[PDB]
């Protein structure tokens, strides 16, 4: 997973 603006996806 990777995080973008707080959310992991």
């Amino acid at each position, epitope marked *: *997973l*990777i*995080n*973008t*603006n*707080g*959310s*992991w*996806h």
Partner: antibody, heavy 117, light 111 residues
């Protein structure tokens, strides 16, 4: 993994606070690299990270006056907090997040910052 | 999202069980994981990772510590509690913006 913070102990109000975190045993081009502070009274506040690719995420209640930067050839990243006030007195921590844990596993000993004239 | 740590403090006797709760106003679960973590902090020391992803034990942490829950309801349990466990404990969620710490729970040892 070892994280060392540096910066000034005493900053005057309405001026900019600048802290450095030096990393050893790991490269800042992997994972995420966070700033955390603890206010007097013990409440903890997450400030934000800079990612392995240079992208940032900021606490919405600080996004206006915070900037997080880095220098890959020094294994350092940097916290900047503008227009400080006495309410920004705290102990400031950097910390690491890896995808192995998705939590802040390695911290540095804090740095104490007092905002005062 | 709001993390309510309960209780704010908690006195327990040596060898007994201590449970600390942390409730969120929205689920901190995504992609099959609970993005909830528990930290211990003592004076003059950074916080220490005890339990990541709600139930997983950090290496070098004694199995007296354990966490459980999903969605919006999580607990940490120390059983049996030891004298070295006197400290403040924090939950933390990083599933979604804004990342936030709990208010903390001061654990006292009754002797």
């Amino acid at each position: 993994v070892q994280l060392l913070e540096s910066g000034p102990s005493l900053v005057k109000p309405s001026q900019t606070l600048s802290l450095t975190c030096s990393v050893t045993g790991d490269s800042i081009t992997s994972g995420y690299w966070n700033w955390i502070r603890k206010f007097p009274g013990n409440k903890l506040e997450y400030m934000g990270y800079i990612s392995y690719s240079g992208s940032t995420y900021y606490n919405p209640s600080l996004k206006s006056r915070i900037s997080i930067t880095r220098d890959t050839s020094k294994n350092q990243y940097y916290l900047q907090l503008n227009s400080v006030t006495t309410e920004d007195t705290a102990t400031y921590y950097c910390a690491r997040i890896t995808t192995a844990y998705y939590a802040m596993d390695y911290w540095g000993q804090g740095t104490s910052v007092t905002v005062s004239s | 999202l709001v993390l309510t740590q309960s209780p704010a403090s908690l006195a327990v006797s040596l060898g007994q069980r201590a449970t600390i709760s942390c409730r969120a106003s929205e689920s901190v679960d995504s992609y099959g994981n609970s993005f909830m973590h528990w930290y211990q902090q003592k004076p003059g020391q950074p916080p220490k990772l005890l339990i990541y992803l709600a139930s997983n034990l950090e290496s070098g942490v004694p199995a007296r510590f354990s966490g459980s829950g999903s969605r919006t309801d999580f607990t940490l349990t120390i059983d049996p509690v030891e004298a070295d466990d006197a400290a403040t404990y924090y939950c933390q969620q990083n599933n979604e913006d804004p990342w936030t710490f709990g208010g903390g729970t001061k654990l006292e040892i009754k002797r």
